[PDB]
Design a binder for this molecule. Sequence first.
Ligand SMILES: Cc1cc2nc3c(=O)[nH]c(=O)nc-3n(C[C@H](O)[C@H](O)[C@H](O)COP(=O)(O)OP(=O)(O)OC[C@H]3O[C@@H](n4cnc5c(N)ncnc54)[C@H](O)[C@@H]3O)c2cc1C
Ligand SMILES: *[C@@H]1O[C@H](CO)[C@@H](O[C@@H]2O[C@H](CO)[C@@H](O)[C@H](O)[C@H]2NC(C)=O)[C@H](O)[C@H]1NC(C)=O
Ligand SMILES: *[C@@H]1O[C@H](CO)[C@@H](O)[C@H](O)[C@H]1NC(C)=O
Ligand SMILES: *[C@@H]1O[C@H](CO)[C@@H](O)[C@H](O)[C@H]1NC(C)=O
Ligand SMILES: *[C@@H]1O[C@H](CO)[C@@H](O)[C@H](O)[C@H]1NC(C)=O
Ligand SMILES: *[C@@H]1O[C@H](CO)[C@@H](O)[C@H](O)[C@H]1NC(C)=O
Ligand SMILES: *[C@@H]1O[C@H](CO)[C@@H](O)[C@H](O)[C@H]1NC(C)=O
Ligand SMILES: *[C@@H]1O[C@H](CO)[C@@H](O)[C@H](O)[C@H]1NC(C)=O
Ligand SMILES: *[C@@H]1O[C@H](CO)[C@@H](O)[C@H](O)[C@H]1NC(C)=O
Ligand SMILES: CC1(C)OCc2cc(C=O)ccc2O1
Length: 518
Amino acid sequence: HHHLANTSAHDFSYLKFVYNATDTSLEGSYDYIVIGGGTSGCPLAATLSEKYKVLLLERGTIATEYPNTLTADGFAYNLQQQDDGKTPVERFVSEDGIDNVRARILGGTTIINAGVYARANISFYSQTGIEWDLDLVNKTYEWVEDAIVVKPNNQSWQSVIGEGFLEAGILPDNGFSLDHEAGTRLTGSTFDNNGTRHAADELLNKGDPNNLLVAVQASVEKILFSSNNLSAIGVIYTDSDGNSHQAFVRGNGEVIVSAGTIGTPQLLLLSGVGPESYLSSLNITVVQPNPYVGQFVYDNPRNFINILPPNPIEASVVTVLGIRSDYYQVSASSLPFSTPPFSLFPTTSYPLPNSTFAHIVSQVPGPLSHGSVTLNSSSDVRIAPNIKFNYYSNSTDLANCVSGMKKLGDLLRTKALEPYKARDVLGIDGFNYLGVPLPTDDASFETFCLDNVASYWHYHGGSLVGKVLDDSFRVMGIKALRVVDASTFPYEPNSHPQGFYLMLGRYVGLQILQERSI
Ligand SMILES: Cc1cc2nc3c(=O)[nH]c(=O)nc-3n(C[C@H](O)[C@H](O)[C@H](O)COP(=O)(O)OP(=O)(O)OC[C@H]3O[C@@H](n4cnc5c(N)ncnc54)[C@H](O)[C@@H]3O)c2cc1C
Ligand SMILES: *[C@@H]1O[C@H](CO)[C@@H](O[C@@H]2O[C@H](CO)[C@@H](O)[C@H](O)[C@H]2NC(C)=O)[C@H](O)[C@H]1NC(C)=O
Ligand SMILES: *[C@@H]1O[C@H](CO)[C@@H](O)[C@H](O)[C@H]1NC(C)=O
Ligand SMILES: *[C@@H]1O[C@H](CO)[C@@H](O)[C@H](O)[C@H]1NC(C)=O
Ligand SMILES: *[C@@H]1O[C@H](CO)[C@@H](O)[C@H](O)[C@H]1NC(C)=O
Ligand SMILES: *[C@@H]1O[C@H](CO)[C@@H](O)[C@H](O)[C@H]1NC(C)=O
Ligand SMILES: *[C@@H]1O[C@H](CO)[C@@H](O)[C@H](O)[C@H]1NC(C)=O
Ligand SMILES: *[C@@H]1O[C@H](CO)[C@@H](O)[C@H](O)[C@H]1NC(C)=O
Ligand SMILES: *[C@@H]1O[C@H](CO)[C@@H](O)[C@H](O)[C@H]1NC(C)=O
Ligand SMILES: CC1(C)OCc2cc(C=O)ccc2O1
């Protein structure tokens, strides 16, 4: 593991080429425009800037404006904070009724997330059928890991949960490993051992400062196309005062959408790329009919129990993973709170913890259930789109939640967890629970799964490879337009996908530079 980061301050050196979108001198022609300074978009823009003039457009501001985004201790704060339209956490509620959040900040969701770092399941590449350069994938993981990933230090709760997973039969013991494999392991973290958050914005430090420009509070409202050989030629973006701006690509350059599972389909639909009948019904002029834009949108379920130990436990960031094919498990330990972190629990109606608690969680893989992103406003990109995930519409997802919940049952029965019981009785009713405890034939587990579901926050889809994009991430039917972010794949690459999407930004950047090379 030569290729890991050190403890270090968050590196804001890149702010020397970050400008307010109010600056009209950013307007003009570039080789590349990247829309969304997020998980994929930052390493993509940094990579393209090695050879070419790049403009990165981000709707949010810089992370220095919200200091609680820069520490492990700050994780809860950013979710607890009210969404005033400027904050790094944007709140939404799916049409299923499940509270959720997305990032609105330079560095994207890597600035607000739970820090867990893993490489994709090595079977994922062949499952996609894309002709990946697998050696280049691994070099690109090392380039990310060298910059922002550490081997975490021991945390007492994470060690308890790892011992519990192993005693519950989540085998083998993989020790410390970044790989998504069956068994129990310590994985990597983008929080360093001093609790400093590292993130995708720091990969902008790898860019060429003579070639890369970043516009913040740049809300990209439309992709501009050639008038006739249909090509993307540029974007309209507005600034924080509401004034409009244009930027263009030139020659053999390209526009890449990296606006996330929610923002990419939304901007494609606003730009007339999407289902012909849907867009016609909104009187949006169709530039490229595609029945799949904003279709196949997925949210992996989170199901959980909360235990209240009779003695305090130390708060922790998640580093210890229990992985099976059919469920991915972790646990966080938290301080109590009287303001809830929005979307931790699926509604605002959830009881508040009075003392320290362990949130013990299982994630459904895939998932197979899907829904869609549709426009709320046919013109205004600042109005969030409608999103529906149809949680547990697919019975296989429900079957996998039942298996995961039975395994959390096994975990609550381990010697590892016994000291955290309020009563030394034989049964798991010896724990004190915040909210609904586990119910042991299948009907009661099914009800528990359905009624107590939350977002894992690892939503993906809406612009899938094989539906909207080709195997090179190009929008089918349009020259000079790509999509690179979590909108691109219908199944998770692993339990914790930020690692894959950080890698993907640079990887596709290297594919574009190779395609263009002589
Ligand atoms: C609370 C939370 C915790 C998570 N924890 C983890 C975890 O610990 N580990 C893990 O592996 N994964 C985790 N995830 C998931 C993972 O972080 C995300 O799936 C991944 O970061 C998504 O990357 P992306 O590039 O698709 O989107 P983002 O990183 O969200 O990037 C999209 C960017 O585009 C910008 N944007 C959107 N629309 C526009 C527009 N029109 N114009 C301009 N800019 C625009 C956004 O502001 C944003 O910065 C978590 C997610 C959340 C929400
Ligand atoms: C890693 O990804 C693979 C491929 O998607 C997962 O799928 C397994 O592989 C076989 C064929 O490759 C399939 O029949 C099953 O869906 C999976 N196998 C089993 C035994 O269930 C695999 O499960 C993923 N691994 C983990 C640990 O998540
Ligand atoms: C250790 O973390 C502290 C917490 O704020 C911070 O002051 C410092 O940057 C870290 N140490 C370093 C960078 O060596
Ligand atoms: C951009 O400029 C405006 C003033 O025109 C200001 O209100 C806003 O905060 C600035 N944004 C950033 C990110 O500096
Ligand atoms: C890439 O790295 C993984 C571990 O993450 C290893 O299993 C795999 O063999 C590597 N593949 C190649 C092509 O080197
Ligand atoms: C526009 O479309 C025509 C098809 O009539 C195509 O041949 C041409 O390459 C395009 N030209 C420009 C300037 O966009
Ligand atoms: C679309 O425009 C036509 C006028 O051409 C109008 O009849 C129809 O109601 C419009 N629909 C919407 C949804 O704006
Ligand atoms: C927009 O969202 C609101 C409130 O979030 C929703 O209830 C309304 O029906 C939506 N409108 C459209 C046209 O989708
Ligand atoms: C669940 O998902 C699969 C797609 O993998 C589909 O074939 C299957 O028919 C779906 N089942 C239900 C109950 O819809
Ligand atoms: C596994 C998961 C979702 O990770 C993050 C997390 C954070 C808190 C902080 O209050 C609490 C619980 C929690 O659980």
